[PDB]
């Protein structure tokens, strides 16, 4: 008899009078005896992200963008960490 | 009888009065017999981030982005942690 | 019989009137009998982070981002860090 068992990931528990702030970005679990393939590419606040696959193939992958651009004077802002703070400003 | 048990994992509790803040960025976990494959590529604030791979290919794999880019004078802000503080100025 | 147990890796507890923070960039588990595979690049504030692979393969792999590029004037900030502080100025 065999056994896996990945229960209960990520999980989280509160009592009393207690906080919480939880924040994922991109699990991917696997259990048994299955295959899986998942590539990601992210990009914020102006930067690149990018990620190629294959398997067996015979192809031909290519990629480019943000090719010759040019923007203008922009003044952005982003927060992603839980209970975080984040500002911006200009002149 | 095998047994493999990774259950748990990055889980979190919390009693009384108390705080608590997470973040998580890009697990993958693989239990059992089978097998997985992700490539990941993350980029922030103006950086770039590549990756790439292959598994009994033949073709040809080919990646340039950001080519002869030219921005303009901006300001950026951003705050990734857990209770961070961020913030940006421009004169 | 045999055993792996891998379990309750980056937990978090908390009682009484206690505070934590926790932030986590790219944890990967393998427990058990399987393969795993998992390459990554990453790219922060202005820098490049790259990564190839192969296995088996006969193919021509090859990158080259930010060629010839020239940005602007800028003014960033990034904060990663548990309960860090960023700041960025320019005059």
């Known amino acids: 008899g065999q056994q896996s068992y990945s229960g209960y990931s990520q999980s989280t ?3 009393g009078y207690g906080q919480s702030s939880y ?3 991109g699990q991917s679990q696997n259990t048994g ?3 899986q393939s998942t590539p990601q590419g992210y990009g914020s606040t102006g930067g ?3 990620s190629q696959s294959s398997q067996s193939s015979y192809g031909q992958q290519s990629s480019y ?3 010759g651009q040019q923007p203008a004077p922009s ?3 982003g927060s992603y960490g839980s209970s975080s703070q984040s500002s911006s400003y200009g002149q």
């Open 75 to 77: 003044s952005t802002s």
């Open 48 to 50: 690149y992200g990018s």
């Open 13 to 15: 528990d509160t009592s």
């Open 33 to 35: 005896y299955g295959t």
């Open 23 to 25: 924040s994922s970005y």
């Open 65 to 67: 963008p943000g090719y």
